[PDB]
Amino acid sequence: HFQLQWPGARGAFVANDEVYFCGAHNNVTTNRTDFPLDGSGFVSIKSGHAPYTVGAIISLETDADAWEDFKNSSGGDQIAIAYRQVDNSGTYCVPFNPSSLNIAGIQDGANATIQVVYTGGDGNLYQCADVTFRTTVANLNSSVCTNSTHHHH
Ligand SMILES: *[C@@H]1O[C@H](CO)[C@@H](O)[C@H](O)[C@H]1NC(C)=O
Ligand SMILES: *[C@@H]1O[C@H](CO)[C@@H](O)[C@H](O)[C@H]1NC(C)=O
Ligand SMILES: *[C@@H]1O[C@H](CO)[C@@H](O)[C@H](O)[C@H]1NC(C)=O
Ligand SMILES: *[C@@H]1O[C@H](CO)[C@@H](O)[C@H](O)[C@H]1NC(C)=O
Ligand SMILES: *[C@@H]1O[C@H](CO)[C@@H](O)[C@H](O)[C@H]1NC(C)=O
Ligand SMILES: *[C@@H]1O[C@H](CO)[C@@H](O)[C@H](O)[C@H]1NC(C)=O
Ligand SMILES: [Cu+2]
Length reported for the chain = 153
Experimental method: X-ray
End-to-end CA distance of the chain: 16
Question: Left (φ > 0), alpha (ψ -120 to 50) or beta: where does 142 sit?
Answer: alpha
Q: Give ligand 4 pocket residues (Cβ under 6 A).
A: 72-74, 76-77, 79
Among the listed residues 141, 147, 112, 120, the one whose alpha carbon sits nearest the alpha carbon of residue 18:
120
115, 126 Cβ separation under 8 angstroms: yes
Residue 24, domain extent: 1-153
Ligand nearest to the CA of 30: 3
Q: CA quadruple 26, 19, 80, 33: dihedral positive or negative?
A: positive
- Report how far residue 27's alpha carbon sits from residue 8's, in angstroms, rounded to the nearest whole number: 15
105, 60 Cβ separation under 8 angstroms: yes
Q: Is the peptide bond before 95 cis (omega within 30 degrees of 0)?
A: no
144, 90 Cβ separation under 8 angstroms: no
Q: CA quadruple 130, 85, 40, 144: dihedral positive or negative?
A: positive
Buried b (16+ CB within 10 A) or exposed e, 25-35: beebbeebbeb
C-beta pairs of 73-80 under 8 Å, 24+ apart in sequence: 78/103, 79/55, 80/55, 80/56, 80/114
Count of domains for the chain: 1
Distance 128 CA to ligand 3 centre (A): 17
Ligand 1 atom closest to residue 33's alpha carbon, by position in its atom list: 13
Q: What is the resolution of this structure in A?
A: 2.1
- Report how far residue 153's alpha carbon sits from residue 150's, in angstroms, rounded to the nearest whole number: 6
Q: Give ligand 6 pocket residues (Cβ under 6 A).
A: 84, 93-94, 145-147
- Report how far residue 93's alpha carbon sits from residue 142's, in angstroms, rounded to the nearest whole number: 10
Give the list of residues 6+ apart from residue 88 with CB closer than 8 angstroms, or none: 50, 147, 148, 149, 150, 153
**Residue type at position 60:** L
What is each CA distance from 4 to 63, 117, 125, in whole angstroms?
A: 20, 11, 12
Backbone angles phi, psi at 82, to 5 degrees: -65, 145
